[PDB]
Design a protein around this nucleic acid. Structure first.
Ligand SMILES: [Mg+2]
Ligand SMILES: [Mg+2]
Ligand SMILES: [Mg+2]
Ligand SMILES: [Mg+2]
Ligand SMILES: [Mg+2]
Ligand SMILES: [Mg+2]
Ligand SMILES: [Mg+2]
Ligand SMILES: [Mg+2]
Ligand SMILES: [Mg+2]
Ligand SMILES: [Mg+2]
Ligand SMILES: [Mg+2]
Ligand SMILES: [Mg+2]
Ligand SMILES: [Mg+2]
Ligand SMILES: [Mg+2]
Ligand SMILES: [Mg+2]
Ligand SMILES: [Mg+2]
Ligand SMILES: [Mg+2]
Ligand SMILES: [Mg+2]
Ligand SMILES: [Mg+2]
Ligand SMILES: [Mg+2]
Ligand SMILES: [Mg+2]
Ligand SMILES: [Mg+2]
Ligand SMILES: [Mg+2]
Ligand SMILES: [Mg+2]
Ligand SMILES: [Mg+2]
Ligand SMILES: [Mg+2]
Ligand SMILES: [Mg+2]
Lengths: 52, 147, 128
RNA sequence: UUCAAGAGGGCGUGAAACCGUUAAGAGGUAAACGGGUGGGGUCCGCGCAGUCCGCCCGGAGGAUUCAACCCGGCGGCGGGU
RNA sequence: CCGACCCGUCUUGAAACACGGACCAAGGAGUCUAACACGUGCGCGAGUCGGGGGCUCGCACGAAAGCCGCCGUGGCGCAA
RNA sequence: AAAAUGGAUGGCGCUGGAGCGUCGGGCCCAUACCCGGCCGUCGCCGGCAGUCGAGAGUGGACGGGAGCGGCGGGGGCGGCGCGCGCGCGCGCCCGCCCCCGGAGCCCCGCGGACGCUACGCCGCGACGAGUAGGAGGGCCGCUGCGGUGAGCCUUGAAGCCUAGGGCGCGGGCCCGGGUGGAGCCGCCGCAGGUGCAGAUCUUGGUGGUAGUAGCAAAUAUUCAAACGAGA
């Protein structure tokens, strides 16, 4: 039921959007895992450039 | 902040702000944008005209990178370069006439909205407009095309 | 003997009783604390004769004497000597009252000093 | 016995409804209620006078340092030729 | 002594021969996200935003804080 | 001109009215009107960071000549105007003409309220019904986080009871006494599973009913002795 002079909108929520939500709470640990992998590779390839 | 709301002020008040003759029942008009032809015809003829129908041709697989032409006017042209340039021109009287690339600073077509001060500038751009080409020659400059 | 305050104007109170809630004489889930009635058929709201009276702002009390004791003094609550010495200069308008949680051995100290500085105490003999 | 059984084996504290007893008071228009007064009890404070306190001036009594003014040191405020 | 019919709710209209209600304690009912419109408050200003990622802290705090040829790939805006 | 429970000028009752009609003086009383006090809101382009007054644009710093006048103008009684100063006083016309680090009583142009938490203090004048509903102020309250009270406490915290003393229009709160046995609160900000009389509400418990209804289908018990506190 609309009213005085707003927008018309079409939101995409008529499915079951709620079993399938995704939290970005593991954002830092994801960063931390990478460094320790990114360091260690460059230690494995010792003098070779780290970038590649 | 719950403590700044108006549910913290309708305690005691029996109906929580929604009447006694008519009540906050579930979905009493429809559910969504239903009824543009039936029993909401008036909101959509009044505040949203052009909604129902169909018009125009169809372009099926449209790529918005082919159609790309960033625009600029003349007033906002001497700001692509620094201040050494515009001042060292009109000076030493050789016919300096500097060069201004627009495709460097992220612009392709040139437009003739404004005016510009009297120095004999040169311009390089892919496209031009009619009036823009005139104003430049009117001040004593030139226009140049590139690929 | 007793410390005289500065002035002692007469005091006048437009109402002396309290305002009880309605239908609290019948029942025990219902209390004496004022809650306003909001029904449609109700007659305290509609103000018939011979019924409960509702509090408005006309019963409001004069401002020269508001929060004023029968002795002319106004009240102030403490917990130690440190916040008592702030009353030295208003020793003829305001009085002191010691909290309920203070120990016996410390009340003696506070009284002993208030008596020096001429700061009246409205409960000088409690625990002993 | 234990500080404590007014902590006694489903024993921390221990509300209300509902009951038993004791103290007071009352009783033929069911009870309860609002405003206004009266009477009686329970407690608070009299004081077993409550005569409240403070400035300056006058009087009679006694008393011991300083200040008034000078000198020495110390500290601070202000100044503008 | 005078006054004075039981509360809630529907209703043009309730003391009702209109429904609910023996009594007490505890629980109990206008929320969270996503998008929009406007009003207010703060900051920068034809510009303004790092939210994704990377450089520094082992993370006691702190899964924070600071920083970036990323410094603008890009989005909203400056032209219909 | 006749109705069904006994029956209503409101009732008792009234006939030189306490009846019917026209009229007088006196009188009674509503939250209305008038006078006053107390509370809140609204309006004053209100007022006060420190000096002038209730009639109509005010103030000094400033040179060459100096007084008896000014202000030689409406039976209008006019903002402008005239006898509470106009040249007063002190030394010797001539001169002085300090003057409030304090004159002298209601304007002091030297700085200031006992008031000045300016989100404050003061003054005037008018108004106040209220459902659904909209807004504001809440030093009304409940649980927890960050800072802060050189906070409270086994010489007794929370909680609970109270013919006790008191405050606020109210929400609610502070003291006093008893019990009890270990933690709790006030201020500035933050946040929320935040305030019940009900919903044939949910869970538990308790009453009147009530020492009541009842312990009635199928023929039937009696006498003595024994164990045993006890039939
Ligand atoms: Mg709208
Ligand atoms: Mg309402
Ligand atoms: Mg509403
Ligand atoms: Mg409703
Ligand atoms: Mg309807
Ligand atoms: Mg009161
Ligand atoms: Mg009604
Ligand atoms: Mg004990
Ligand atoms: Mg115990
Ligand atoms: Mg027990
Ligand atoms: Mg009893
Ligand atoms: Mg209605
Ligand atoms: Mg009907
Ligand atoms: Mg009703
Ligand atoms: Mg009926
Ligand atoms: Mg129904
Ligand atoms: Mg029933
Ligand atoms: Mg509850
Ligand atoms: Mg905005
Ligand atoms: Mg009103
Ligand atoms: Mg313990
Ligand atoms: Mg919570
Ligand atoms: Mg809730
Ligand atoms: Mg309940
Ligand atoms: Mg209710
Ligand atoms: Mg029987
Ligand atoms: Mg039988």
């Amino acid at each position: 039921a609309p009213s005085r002079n707003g927008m018309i909108l079409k939101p995409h929520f008529h499915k079951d959007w709620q079993r399938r939500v995704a939290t970005w709470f593991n954002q830092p640990a994801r960063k931390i895992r990478r460094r320790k992998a990114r360091q260690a590779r460059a230690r494995r390839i010792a003098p070779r450039p780290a970038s590649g | 902040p719950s403590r700044l709301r108006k549910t913290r002020k309708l305690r005691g008040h029996v109906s929580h702000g929604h009447g006694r003759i008519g009540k906050h029942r579930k979905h009493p008009g429809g559910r969504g944008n239903a009824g543009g032809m039936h029993h909401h015809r008036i909101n959509f003829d009044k505040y949203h005209p052009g909604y129902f129908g169909k018009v125009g041709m169809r372009h099926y697989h449209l790529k918005r990178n082919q159609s790309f032409c960033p625009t600029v006017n003349l007033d906002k042209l001497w700001t692509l370069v620094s201040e050494q340039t515009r001042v060292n021109a009109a000076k030493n009287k050789t016919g300096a006439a500097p060069i201004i690339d627009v495709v460097r600073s992220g612009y392709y077509k040139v437009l003739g909205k404004g005016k510009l001060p009297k120095q004999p500038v040169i311009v390089k751009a892919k496209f031009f407009s009619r009036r823009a080409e005139e104003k430049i020659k009117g001040v004593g400059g030139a226009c140049v095309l590139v690929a | 003997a007793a410390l005289r305050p500065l002035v002692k104007p007469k005091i006048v109170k437009k109402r002396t009783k309290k305002f009880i809630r309605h239908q609290s004489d019948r029942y025990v889930k219902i209390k004496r604390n004022w809650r306003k009635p909001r029904g449609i058929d109700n007659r305290v709201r509609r103000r018939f004769k011979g019924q409960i009276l509702m509090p408005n702002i006309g019963y409001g009390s004069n401002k020269k004497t508001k929060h004023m004791l029968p002795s002319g003094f106004r009240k102030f609550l403490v917990h130690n000597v440190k916040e008592l010495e702030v009353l030295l200069m208003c020793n003829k308008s305001y009085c002191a009252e010691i909290a309920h949680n203070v120990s016996s051995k410390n009340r003696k100290a506070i009284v002993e000093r208030a008596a020096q500085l001429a700061i009246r105490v409205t409960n000088p003999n409690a625990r002993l």
